[PDB]
């Protein structure tokens, strides 16, 4: 009864098959993430990933920024999150420019057209998620005080 | 029988012949010098017994006799300390007035004006103030006269002679065989039950029969010269029974299990003695007696000539599960064949135990009048912290030495060692990542707070008057331990230490112990400590796990444990050995222990140590500056480093001026160390070529050709002078400051 | 004090001159490495052989002399 | 790739070839020495530059010489 | 302080019971040494030492909790 | 005055170190012995050992006695 | 030629094995024959047990293969080992021993590469060969 | 740190980091174009010298200007 096995039945590759790396739960979670899920265009992978990360990017800027004790804390935090989103989109753009040669293939992430679609989706999702987080914190007083409003 | 005594008689003749032949132990070195490198090789590899011969028996005999020689040196040192306490100390005057007489057991001769170092230490005595804590130990042991110290010195000298004679006998006359050394079960049984167990029992006997009545008379205010001699406490049961009436009942309550009758001299009071500021000696007597009972019970565990007992090989091989393959199989052979693995384990444990000793001895002062002796407390904490760190790094080093030399992959197939080697990349990568995470979210807090205070934004800082990082877990543990007497420890009168909370124990208007609160600065500095310890672990573990091979050097085990490099190729393979990883980990141990002792010194001087005056307010040494200053590097630089160095730089013309001299000298030597650390061998070899030309011009070139120190020796010399300089600088600064203000 | 600090300055100037002149004059070759001019002005070493050859180039003598120059201006 | 040269001071002791971890040198027939052989470097594209051959050479100042040049994947010792 | 008692017949009864239980347990569980064949002096010493240990622990615990 | 003195003296140290470094580069790259037979440069190279040894002697002299006076006074 | 169907030594796997550059840039192979099943140390870290008969192993670097060859030569007296280079296209290039005879032994047909016809002290100064493509050897 | 610690330790750490990045999901979709290596020996000497020299200059300039300003300005 051994729980740790050579990866992919190859003992000489630089990896091991472990319960953390190769169990059914880990494989299901990785295969159901948008970066690996089958049947998705790169644009929709970008949209989901951008929605998630841009949605969670609003929080630290609103709660810990230099304007956090002012009345415009949420507006400043959303604007800072949008600036970080623009910087990361520029990072994606230069990565795709330098990493891929121009090929006909556009249904994979590691192609030039596919990465450009992924970057476009990530920008649009990041703006949408950040705006949704701004709306929710603006309209719900529970999120404005992060739970001290119950006390 | 299986455990027996086997000895070879007269294996090595006692002669002075090899004394005249340096390098006799090494076949390479016995040919004699041709270069100056030979001398350094002779002094560097001399006690590396396993590299001179392949016979394990001779190596073990050499190890046993060298341990006897070290024990002889330690007994000579102890006898010296007792004699210098007996003849050149103010110990009786300190016994009469502990709160006003500075301990001093070193007197200098007047030669060049150094008699100024014989400072006015009180009690009509002039000498160098000592901080080793021997006076408090002798007061705890019941030593009331210098005659007893003279007899202790004589006993130490006799034991030193006995140890050196035992070394000569057990190497040169009757050397034990390899089968005698390879009895781990018998050695553990005898050393657990006889060494630790009977030692604890006899010291509990000494504490109960000698230390308790003498110290009870001392705390009641009796002068030492009218206190009865210890043998009078032994023979006069009435004289003891006035102080502890249970001695009137004799040993009948012990054998009839009516032990609560003995509750007056075996207590579990806890806290501290209000008269002396130390632990109750009855608590220590029960403690060592309980340790004696537990150790003697533990010393009957392991299997021997008779059928009872555990077999450690069976215990190791039985513990194996689905995640770990063969489990602990093969470790018994490793630990019964390789001395280096045992040295690794025992050095690691002794270092951790020394660190535990430092923490538990500052927090719970065990000796009378040692709590208000602030130099003694700071000295023993810093000293045992440094010894602990050195021993831990040595355990890692000698683990790496085992990995290079004594590891056999054929006998280590799919056991824990093999699987640790087989996921070394995951270990080092995850540890490296967590070290970078710790570095960012610990040191960047200090950098961030420095910038915010510099930018005039005090409300943006990490502090108690700003955005807070409260140590809620440690405060909760402190609350539990303060609430522990009577709730989870119903038989304790007081807390184990007042550092968790409670009253201010003060002795002679000086704080013995008070509660040590934990705030944002304590949070940041404890996570700095965790960061530094994890980085030291990263360096040492990466050196150990990659000691035999790596992706860079696939045959690193053939090069050995200690080599400078594998050439400039592969981009450069400099400092690729495990020895160089130990070389860097010693620097990081220095950094870690330095930050730990700086935290200790500042926190005790700011929040614990101080003077008690009227209306019960406590005036601390630095006035409580730790909470607002230890959150920035600038606060550490100004209020701790700049502020407390005033005493060592203005010590000139006083008795502490030697510390200032040592301060400067350590400042010199550490900088001198960088000349070895930053430079390389080829420059010095060509400069030595020019100097050799100069000596050739006057026909005064030596026959032994001078060579530059080796690359490994350059690193080692730079590290040794660096460690000496840094530890001496902290030594002089700490000692001058704490003698002056405390 | 002025006497002592000028003689210290003379010490530092002479020592920096020693490092720099020794680097310039041994740049073409030494007893440890007689073909140094074939390897250029800057290279890491000549390997661990012949006792070890760390910091043997004249660029390394520049590197060592920079600390002494900082010391002298300090 | 690094450049490895063998000069005619070679005595054909074969130590440099035995010290090479990357199989860069080999012994070829020659008439310049009593051993009747000289070292050669036909495979310097696999040379990492470790200079173990230079450490192994017993002739006063070395007969085999390694000149570090342009770094490649093989010469940098990269398993990635 | 936990209450301990002077020696009595109850203390002897607990100690004797602890010795007899530890002798039977040592008879049954010791791996390396009709039913009492091979019973030697070291095994008797070990079993009776555990009997004194268990009896002391039981006597102190029952004296604490009031069973006496 | 302090800033101007410190600035231009550090510039001076950098310039002198650069002078010696680029002289070493001149020996590495540009020095032709055959065009400089029995020249002053060649005679520097022919008694370079005396120059370096006497620089070492004066540096050790200065450091030994200057540090000895300073430590003596301390 | 490299037989791809040679069985491999029994190994439980490790994190030290070959990375993506082995399948993308180049990979190395070592084959050898053992007289018995015996435990050897992997050059990437860890212990493996080689089978009786032929053994094929894959590595990322040539030096790792030659380190394993030296280890089995000095610990198991195995000298019949062969080292090949494999590209992603599938072309196999035999590397060691190149002509069947080990490089420390003289074999006929070998030609000297990089041999210089003078001592090392007769190399040219850079000033002759500055602004000129002449070699420093002459 | 660039003048005391030398190359092979950092190079093996970078081998470990390359393995960690290549074996981590959601990050091996991103690949470097240049292989990460440790700094070379001469480069590391130069970088340690640069950090050392900058610290020397900035420390003394800050000290002399702030000290002269505090005493006299
Ligand atoms: C109960 C018996 C007993 C005792 C007390 C010891 C004690 C010791 N052994 Mg040990 N040993 C024993 C049995 C015992 N051994 C057996 C049976 C074996 C074989 C399996 C070994 C094999 C062994 C090895 C291989 C080594 C030791 C070492 C040591 C020393 C550890 C260092 C230390 O803490 O010294 C401080 C502790 C002290 C008590 C200091 C006093 C030292 C003397 C010798 C104690 C003598 C006590 C005496 C018997 C009783 C007189 C007391 C009183 C009645 C007057 C220590 C003195 C190590 C060492 O340093 O060897 C030199 C070591 O390397 N032992
Ligand atoms: C008739 C049977 C009997 C009875 C009724 C008792 C009853 C008792 N025994 Mg007792 N005992 C017995 C038999 C018995 N024992 C036997 C046969 C022995 C063997 C000789 C002992 C030995 C023994 C000792 C040595 C002690 C007791 C104590 C006690 C009292 C403890 C009360 C309590 O809350 O525990 C305390 C409960 C706790 C949770 C405290 C924690 C204890 C330590 C600190 C925990 C350490 C854990 C450690 C870190 C490992 C954890 C990690 C893990 C994941 C591996 C209790 C009245 C204690 C006593 O007298 O106190 C006054 C005591 O010290 N017993
Ligand atoms: C190895 C350690 C050690 C040593 C050498 C001694 C030595 C001694 N103890 Mg002691 N003792 C010790 C540990 C030790 N003790 C511990 C740990 C305890 C706590 C349980 C005691 C509790 C104790 C008591 C309560 C008494 C002694 C007594 C004695 C003396 C024996 C006289 C006698 O037989 O009266 C036997 C008396 C009977 C009534 C029977 C002797 C000086 C006796 C004495 O003379 O007092 C000074 C005495 O009454 N001891
Ligand atoms: C239990 C303690 C212990 C023991 C028995 C050993 C034993 C051994 N170690 Mg080990 N080691 C230890 C602790 C220990 N070490 C610790 C704590 C460290 C961390 C610092 C190390 C680090 C270490 C390394 C890195 C190496 C060893 C090596 C060795 C072996 C040969 C040592 C030798 O020949 O030195 C001979 C003795 C000397 C060279 C004397 C050293 C003098 C020191 C450097 C200076 C002391 C300064 C002084 C205290 C202050 C003076 C200042 C004053 C002038 C002002 C030997 C097996 C070496 C080896 O080859 O292992 C196989 C090796 O490479 N060890
Ligand atoms: C004070 C000087 C200093 C500093 C800052 C470092 C920093 C570091 N060392 Mg080092 N080291 C030093 C001196 C220093 N060392 C010395 C003197 C030695 C002598 C022996 C060593 C020996 C040594 C070894 C042997 C090892 C390290 C390791 C590390 C790394 C630990 C990871 C970490 O904490 O990340 C946190 C990073 C910091 C604390 C640096 C400061 C960054 C803060 C947060 C501010 C950030 C500002 C921001 C980036 C600026 C952006 C502006 C933009 C314009 C660029 C880190 C890069 C280890 C390593 O790399 O493993 C992980 C390792 O193995 N070092
Ligand atoms: C009283 C305190 C004192 C102390 C402790 C020292 C200590 C030292 N001096 Mg010193 N010195 C002192 C006072 C002192 N000096 C004074 C007052 C003078 C002025 C005359 C000198 C002049 C002096 C010189 C000129 C030299 C030293 C050197 C040295 C160092 C090596 C010792 C030595 O000669 O090697 C023992 C001797 C030998 C190994 C070989 C003999 C070489 C001697 C010095 C030649 C003397 C005869 C020669 C013909 C005179 C030439 C001098 C000429 C250049 C003016 C040593 C650290 C030497 C040094 O630093 O080396 C770089 C060195 O060259 N000292
Ligand atoms: C405070 C630090 C310090 C000190 C004292 C030295 C000292 C020295 N360096 Mg140096 N160096 C340092 C830092 C330091 N370096 C650093 C950080 C670097 C950058 C990497 C260099 C780079 C460097 C180079 C590149 C060169 C030197 C040279 C020299 C030597 C000649 C200069 C001199 O004054 O001679 C006088 C010597 C001294 C003042 C040294 C102290 C002498 C002591 C005090 C004598 C007494 C010893 C004592 C009795 C020993 C007892 C100990 C015992 C009990 C254990 C001398 C040994 C040059 C050289 O070798 O010239 C010949 C040389 O070429 N060093
Ligand atoms: C905490 C770790 C822990 O819970 O270990 C528990 C587990 C122990 O596995 P087994 O029960 O197979 O172990 C049996 C032997 O290890 C001891 O008998 O260790 C591992 O899974 C390997 C270490 C993983 C460590 C990850 C970091
Ligand atoms: C909790 C749990 C316990 C411990 C373990 C654990 C597993 C680690 C942990 C889980 C943790 C972590 C991982 C929690 C997982 C977290 C993430 C951050 C949740 C993100 C949700 C984004 C949703 C709300 C929005 C999409 C935006 C909507 C559609 C848009 C509207 C927009 C669209 C474009 C249309 C136009 C209008 C606008 C408004 C512009
Ligand atoms: C200075 C230095 C040297 C030169 C050190 C020399 C070679 C050894 C000095 C040892 C002396 C001779 C012994 C102690 C000196 C005493 C103060 C006086 C000498 C007494 C004589 C009678 C021997 C190196 O060899 C070296 C190697 C690698 C990295 C850095 C360095 C390095 O910085
Ligand atoms: C820490 C350390 C490393 C690790 C250093 C890593 C590889 C480099 C980290 C630097 C990051 C990647 C960029 C730093 C950015 C700088 C602030 C500015 C660079 C851009 C300007 C030059 C324009 C080595 O590679 C090394 C090699 C040889 C001897 C000693 C050491 C050594 O001590
Ligand atoms: S500089 Fe020194 S340690 Fe580094 S590769 Fe060269 S010889 Fe080895
Ligand atoms: S430098 Fe190393 S790899 Fe290159 S030829 Fe010499 S020994 Fe072989
Ligand atoms: S080691 Fe030197 S002498 Fe020997 S064969 Fe090689 S080049 Fe010739």
Short mmCIF file of C-alpha atoms in Angstrom, two decimals, chain H:
data_model
loop_
_atom_site.label_atom_id
_atom_site.label_comp_id
_atom_site.label_asym_id
_atom_site.label_seq_id
_atom_site.Cartn_x
_atom_site.Cartn_y
_atom_site.Cartn_z
CA UNK H 1 25.95 39.02 0.31
CA UNK H 2 27.34 39.16 -3.21
CA UNK H 3 30.87 39.41 -1.78
CA UNK H 4 30.64 36.63 0.85
CA UNK H 5 28.24 34.05 -0.61
CA UNK H 6 29.41 32.58 -3.92
CA UNK H 7 27.86 31.07 -6.98
CA UNK H 8 27.14 27.34 -6.69
CA UNK H 9 24.76 27.62 -3.73
CA UNK H 10 22.64 30.19 -5.57
CA UNK H 11 22.83 28.20 -8.81
CA UNK H 12 21.46 25.07 -7.10
CA UNK H 13 18.73 27.19 -5.48
CA UNK H 14 17.81 28.44 -8.97
CA UNK H 15 17.67 24.78 -10.14
CA UNK H 16 15.21 24.15 -7.30
CA UNK H 17 13.20 27.26 -8.30
CA UNK H 18 13.12 26.15 -11.95
CA UNK H 19 11.74 22.78 -10.84
CA UNK H 20 9.19 24.54 -8.61
CA UNK H 21 7.93 26.81 -11.39
CA UNK H 22 7.85 23.99 -13.96
CA UNK H 23 5.90 21.71 -11.60
CA UNK H 24 3.39 24.26 -10.23
CA UNK H 25 -0.06 24.27 -11.88
CA UNK H 26 -1.49 27.59 -13.18
CA UNK H 27 2.07 28.96 -13.49
CA UNK H 28 3.66 26.55 -16.00
CA UNK H 29 1.32 28.06 -18.59
CA UNK H 30 3.78 30.98 -18.33
CA UNK H 31 7.31 30.21 -19.52
CA UNK H 32 10.50 32.24 -19.42
CA UNK H 33 12.29 33.03 -22.66
CA UNK H 34 15.74 33.11 -21.03
CA UNK H 35 16.81 30.37 -18.63
CA UNK H 36 17.28 31.67 -15.06
CA UNK H 37 20.89 31.34 -13.90
CA UNK H 38 22.93 32.68 -11.02
CA UNK H 39 25.02 35.78 -11.62
CA UNK H 40 28.54 35.07 -12.81
CA UNK H 41 31.56 35.44 -10.52
CA UNK H 42 32.87 38.72 -11.99
CA UNK H 43 29.30 40.07 -12.27
CA UNK H 44 28.61 39.19 -8.62
CA UNK H 45 31.84 40.88 -7.51
CA UNK H 46 30.81 43.98 -9.48
CA UNK H 47 27.23 43.99 -8.10
CA UNK H 48 28.41 43.58 -4.51
CA UNK H 49 30.93 46.37 -5.14
CA UNK H 50 28.17 48.60 -6.55
CA UNK H 51 25.82 48.06 -3.58
CA UNK H 52 28.79 48.49 -1.17
CA UNK H 53 29.97 51.70 -2.85
CA UNK H 54 26.46 53.19 -3.04
CA UNK H 55 25.98 52.47 0.66
CA UNK H 56 29.35 54.05 1.50
CA UNK H 57 28.59 57.22 -0.50
CA UNK H 58 24.96 57.64 0.57
CA UNK H 59 25.72 56.94 4.25
CA UNK H 60 28.53 59.48 4.43
CA UNK H 61 26.69 62.12 2.37
CA UNK H 62 23.58 61.87 4.55
CA UNK H 63 25.72 61.96 7.71
CA UNK H 64 27.84 64.96 6.72
CA UNK H 65 24.95 67.07 5.37
CA UNK H 66 22.49 66.33 8.20
CA UNK H 67 25.17 66.70 10.90
CA UNK H 68 26.45 70.02 9.56
CA UNK H 69 22.86 71.27 9.15
CA UNK H 70 21.89 70.20 12.68
CA UNK H 71 24.91 71.78 14.34
CA UNK H 72 25.17 74.96 12.26
CA UNK H 73 22.10 75.45 10.04
#
